[PDB]
RNA sequence: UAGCGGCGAGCGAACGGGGAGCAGCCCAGAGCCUGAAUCAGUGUGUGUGUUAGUGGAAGCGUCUGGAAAGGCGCGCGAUACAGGGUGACAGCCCCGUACACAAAAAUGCACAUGCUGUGAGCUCGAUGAGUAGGGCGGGACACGUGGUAUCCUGUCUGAAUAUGGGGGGACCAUCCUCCAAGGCUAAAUACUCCUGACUGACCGAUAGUGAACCAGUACCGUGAGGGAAAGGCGAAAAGAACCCCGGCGAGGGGAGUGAAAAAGAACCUGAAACCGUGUACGUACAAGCAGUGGGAGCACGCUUAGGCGUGUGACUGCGUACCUUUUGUAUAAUGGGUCAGCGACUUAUAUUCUGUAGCAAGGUUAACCGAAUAGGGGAGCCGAAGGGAAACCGAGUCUUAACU
């Protein structure tokens, strides 16, 4: 029972090359380079599902720090204030209020300064 | 083929009742007047092949 | 129903296929490690080879001799001799019952369990315990 | 145990050890796989590197060409080169122990009785050696795919079943596991039932 | 053309010349080796 | 296994048992007696086989379709439903198959028979000499000179000859067995250049022969020798009349055939690398494994605006390929120009362990016979008993004068 291996090899190669559309040059044409490109894209994608949590958090902290200094207190003192005021709003939402609702953020700063004093 | 016995091992080990192998002790062929009689008396009975070496012996003696 | 028969559970184990991929477990080196004499095709040392140290089967002395006569002695239990078809036991009458072998010249009637019928043993050596066991269950031993 | 005859409406007394035991599916599977393996004429050979029609001249010098080193034009890596582990004609027979063969037949006969795939007739013979007569006879008995098994092999029945595809006539001596399992219904003559019990003890 | 190309690839497969790399290519490898000693 | 063995690596019997097959004879030598069985060579007759052959069952309607053997409906053959072809898949269209027959002639085999040659059978006698054996050297015996029997002989020698001689594993004696120094002999057995039939959990064009094709060719080499690549239009050539561009071209565009000519001979399918044309987006102040996480804008589709999907991707965080070998590689260490095809833990036989199945103090047969994967075949192997170097003893045994 000789098994020719054309049809299944074609299917594997094609699977990998479909996962590499949009890559520059051989990275999207040649199998032997698109295999490495697809794997290295896999490793980066893993690594960056962790980094997007780190990057979004540092973005939010920069926005709360900006808006809170606009209301006359730093980020450090603001988070200490709200923790002592026993407010448990996470900082995705504090960043989002700090962009969209300036008056609510002003009131949060008043709770923070009220408890912090 | 059929497995050939390592033939000079069959002359030196002999199988026992629970699968172990007995052998004659070394050191009792010549130079003998220098040895104590306590050595020589303790080298006369036959002895079991130790745990380390049964692998080798079973490999050399596949029909015994 | 030939497409519904199926083997037992545990009887057909897979079979190691070496050299196929990373997932399989045995790819690249097939389970034989890095370089050396053992990772080589045909590679391996012979039996009883300890590096060059004098091997165990060759640093120990040789003893004994082979008898020539122990190859024609036999050893009859008492579980048989109810199998002899006759109630009389000689070397033939045992050979005829496929119980000793044709080349056998000497035989012996070791106590190895449970004679029942009265048996007349002729021309065979009998051990002590089995003389008592043959004579206890009826029986007769002449020589 | 009793087998109800189809036409005479009697009951044939059989052994419970032969026609009334359990189905050992593992045992039957071993005897079926072994029977089918015994049918393989294992005739084939590829050419190793030694048998390929070439020369043992080394195709280029060992060193200095920038080519990879090669030594024979019959290497298995080379096109036209000789199979690495080329096959030889081989025997595919398995040993089936006699008590495992008989055990397997006892299991399959017990399941042909238990699944109503076993028909016991008193006589089953055809008038003339015509396939038309056997076709009409099997049509009257509501049987299309059938293994007729008779204790005395009739000549006319054998010639009448030789063109019918689904129908096979055997003597009671030469039954095999794969046909008792293969055919939908097995029709045994009563004499064949007695001979089967003599075979299978 | 294909036959002449297979034979004319087969030209320096069994060579001997040591000062020429691969039988034909001129070099200075005699002086390179000789100076390395 | 016993043994042989720098007692290493390894080599490795016989006796005896089971089967296949079975067959015995002649000369060394005279008389009686003849053609007496015996084969060999030939003629003839019979039987059978080979080399050409002959007959050989049984179907139509309708739907899809280029075409029906396909679907649906209703029939018939079958000692014939092995197979191949026919415009798709046919038991009933064709060739065949089962079955039943056929040879003027030449032949193979087997009986019968004619002739020739050959010799039966009886009594008595003989019963293989430079030979057996020996010394020296070497070889074959499983046996390597060893305590080495036995066989063969290059060299030197050298008997007895049935009141005799050979062997029985140094050797002697006793006992048993056999008759060398002359020869013939079927079957079981081994093999396939070659022919026929059939079969394949063999290959299907980089495979299978090196060779599916005018292949041991082209080609290479002084020579011996080495040694390729290369299959497939269509059901049928109906293989493109004629017209136009063009050099009375090449190539093309129509026309026509065709079910289909991106089925047009550079011909089934028609992948990938590689090269183009067209459209959307980005890209000419921006540094690096070229992605990834975020992400504006733009273009197409939507969408009861639901704010989505696809393509692109400014800008921005992070980010030095894969393999291999290594203490450690982005490494400026190895390998790879890319694609496509092939390319590496197999097979056989023994032995051990695990799983599983059968039977169980028993399990199982091998060769072979074969109604032949059945059933016979228990020769044998393994186990139920060990100890001891061995005799021997035996649930004990060995050690030892004997064992707390």
DSSP result, D20-73 = S----HHHHHHHHHHHHHHT---------TTTSSS----SS-SSSSSSPP---T
Structure-token pair, residue D193: 């039932």
φ, ψ of residue D21 in degrees (nearest 5): -100, -175
- Rg of chain D's alpha carbons, rounded to an integer? 27
Q: Are residues D105 and D177 in contact, defined by beta-carbon separation less than 8 angstroms? A: yes
Q: Name the neighbours of C, counting chains with at least 3 Cβ pairs within 8 A.
A: B, D
Domains of chain D: total: 1
**Residue listed under structure tokens 């038309």:** D132
Q: Is the CB of D55 under 7 A from strand F?
A: yes
Q: How far apart are CA C86 and CA C119, in angstroms?
A: 9
Q: Is the CB of B62 under 7 A from strand F?
A: yes
Structure-token pair, residue B21: 């192998």
Please tell me the number of Cα atoms within 13 Å of A14 on its side-chain side.
6
Q: How far apart are CA A58 and CA A56, in angstroms?
A: 5
> What order of strands is seen across the sheet that includes strand C88-89?
C88-89, C120-122, C140-142
Query: CA-CA distances (angstroms) from residue D44 to D40, D87, D90, D115?
Result: 11, 7, 8, 41
- Rg of chain C's alpha carbons, rounded to an integer? 29
Q: Are residues D170 and D71 in contact, defined by beta-carbon separation less than 8 angstroms? A: no
Q: Are residues D107 and D23 in contact, defined by beta-carbon separation less than 8 angstroms? A: yes
Query: CA-CA distances (angstroms) from residue C56 to B7, B16, B55, E17?
Result: 13, 18, 11, 55
Pair type for strands D185-189 and D118-121: parallel
Element (H, E) at D119: strand D118-121
Q: How far does the CA of residue E10 sit from the closest CA of chain D (Å)?
A: 9
DSSP tag of B27: S
Structure-token pair, residue C45: 């040392």
Which single residue has its CA nearest the C1' atom of nucleotide F81?
A: D163
Provide the CA C68 to C1' F14 distance, Å, integer: 14
φ, ψ of residue D200 in degrees (nearest 5): -85, 10
Q: Are residues E15 and D60 in contact, defined by beta-carbon separation less than 8 angstroms? A: no
Residue C60 exposed, middle or buried by CB count within 10 Å (0-12, 13-18, 19+):
buried
Q: How far apart are CA D169 and CA D191, in angstroms?
A: 14
Alpha helices in chain E (DSSP H): 2-7, 29-36
Q: Which of A41, A16, A40 is closest to A30 using CA atoms?
A: A16
Chain breaks in chain D (C to N over 2.5 A) after: none
Please tell me the number of Cα atoms within 13 Å of C121 on its side-chain side.
28
Q: Which residues of chain B does C55 touch, with a Cβ-Cβ cutoff of 8 Å?
A: 56
Q: How far apart are CA D178 and CA D181, in angstroms?
A: 5
Query: CA-CA distances (angstroms) from residue D17 to C119, D12, D20, D178?
Result: 37, 15, 6, 21
| CA of residue E18 relative to chain centroid, distance | 8
Q: Are residues C93 and C112 in contact, defined by beta-carbon separation less than 8 angstroms? A: no
Q: How far apart are CA C124 and CA D74, in angstroms?
A: 69
Q: How many residues are there in chain E? A: 37
φ, ψ of residue D47 in degrees (nearest 5): -95, 125
Q: Which of C114, C123, C70 is closest to C93 using CA atoms?
A: C123
Q: Which residues of chain D does C11 touch, with a Cβ-Cβ cutoff of 8 Å?
A: 26
Q: Helix, strand or coil for residue E14? A: coil
Q: Is the CB of D103 under 7 A from strand F?
A: yes
* CATH at residue D105: 3.40.1370.10
Nearest CA in chain D to E17: D64
Q: What is the residue range of D68's domain? A: 2-200
User: In this structure, how many other beta carbons lie within 10 angstroms of the beta carbon of residue A79?
Assistant: 18
User: In this structure, how many other beta carbons lie within 10 angstroms of the beta carbon of residue D128?
Assistant: 10
Q: Which phi-psi region, left, alpha or beta, contains residue E19 (left: φ > 0; alpha: ψ -120 to 50)?
A: alpha
Structure-token pair, residue B16: 């026992």
Q: Helix, strand or coil for residue D118? A: strand
The structure was resolved to a resolution in Å of 3.4
- What technique was this entry resolved by? cryo-EM
φ, ψ of residue C57 in degrees (nearest 5): -80, 15
CATH class as words, domain C68-141 = alpha beta
Query: CA-CA distances (angstroms) from residue D185 to B11, D79, D180?
Result: 65, 54, 8
Residue C3 at interface with chain D, using a CB cutoff of 8 Å: no
Q: Which residues of chain C does B11 touch, with a Cβ-Cβ cutoff of 8 Å?
A: 62-64
Q: Are residues C88 and C98 in contact, defined by beta-carbon separation less than 8 angstroms? A: no
Q: How far apart are CA C61 and CA B12, in angstroms?
A: 6
Q: How far apart are CA A94 and CA A34, in angstroms?
A: 43
Q: Which of D194, D190, D138, D187 is closest to D165 using CA atoms?
A: D138
Q: How far apart are CA D110 and CA D116, in angstroms?
A: 10
């Amino acid at each position: 029972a000789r098994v020719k291996r054309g049809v299944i090899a074609r299917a594997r190669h094609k699977k990998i090359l479909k996962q590499a559309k949009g890559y520059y040059g051989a990275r999207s044409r040649v199998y032997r380079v698109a295999f490495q490109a697809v794997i290295k894209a896999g490793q980066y994608a893993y690594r960056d599902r962790r980094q997007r949590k780190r990057q979004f958090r540092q973005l939010w902290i920069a926005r709360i720090n900006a808006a809170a200094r606009q209301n006359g207190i730093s980020y450090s003192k603001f988070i200490n204030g709200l923790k002592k005021a026993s407010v448990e709003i996470d900082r995705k939402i504090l960043a989002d209020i700090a962009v969209f609702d300036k008056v609510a953020f002003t009131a949060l700063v008043e709770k923070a300064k009220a408890a912090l004093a | 083929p059929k497995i050939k016995t390592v033939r000079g091992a069959a002359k030196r080990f002999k199988k026992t009742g629970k699968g172990g192998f007995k052998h004659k002790h070394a050191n009792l062929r010549h130079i003998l007047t220098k040895k104590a009689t306590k050595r020589k008396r303790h080298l006369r009975p036959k002895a079991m092949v130790s745990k380390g070496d049964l692998g080798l012996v079973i490999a050399c003696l596949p029909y015994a | 129903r030939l497409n519904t028969l199926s083997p037992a559970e545990g009887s057909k184990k897979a079979g190691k296929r070496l050299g196929r991929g990373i997932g399989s477990g045995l790819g690249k080196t097939g389970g034989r490690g890095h370089k050396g004499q053992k990772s080589r095709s045909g590679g391996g040392v012979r039996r009883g080879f300890e590096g060059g140290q004098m091997p165990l089967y060759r640093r120990l002395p040789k003893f004994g001799f082979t008898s020539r006569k122990a190859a024609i002695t036999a050893e009859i239990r008492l579980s048989d001799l109810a199998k002899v078809e006759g109630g009389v036991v000689d070397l033939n009458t045992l050979k005829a019952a496929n119980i000793i072998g044709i080349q056998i010249e000497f035989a012996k009637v070791i106590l190895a369990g449970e004679v029942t019928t009265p048996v007349t043993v002729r021309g065979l050596r009998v051990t002590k315990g089995a003389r008592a066991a043959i004579e206890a269950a009826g029986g007769k031993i002449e020589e | 145990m009793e087998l109800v005859l189809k036409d005479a409406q009697s009951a044939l007394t059989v052994s419970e050890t032969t026609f009334g035991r359990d189905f050992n599916e593992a045992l039957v599977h071993q005897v079926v796989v072994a029977y089918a393996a015994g049918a393989r004429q294992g005739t084939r050979a590829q050419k190793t590197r030694a048998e390929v029609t070439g020369s043992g001249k080394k195709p280029w010098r060992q060193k200095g060409t920038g080519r990879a080193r090669s030594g024979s034009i019959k290497s298995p890596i080379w096109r036209s080169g000789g199979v690495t582990f080329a096959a030889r004609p081989q025997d595919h027979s398995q040993k089936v122990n006699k008590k495992m063969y008989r055990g397997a037949l006892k299991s399959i006969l017990s399941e042909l009785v238990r699944q109503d795939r076993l028909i016991v007739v008193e006589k089953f013979s055809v008038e003339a050696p015509k396939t038309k007569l056997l076709a009409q006879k099997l049509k009257d008995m509501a049987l299309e795919d059938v293994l007729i098994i008779t204790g005395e092999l009739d000549e006319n029945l054998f010639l009448a079943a030789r063109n019918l595809h689904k129908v096979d006539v055997r003597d009671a001596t030469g039954i095999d596991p794969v046909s008792l399992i293969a055919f939908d219904k097995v029709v045994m003559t009563a004499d064949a039932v007695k001979q089967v019990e003599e075979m299978l003890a | 053309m294909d036959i002449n190309w297979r034979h004319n690839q087969s030209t320096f497969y069994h060579f001997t010349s040591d000062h020429r790399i691969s039988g034909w290519k001129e070099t200075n490898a005699m002086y390179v080796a000789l100076n390395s000693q």
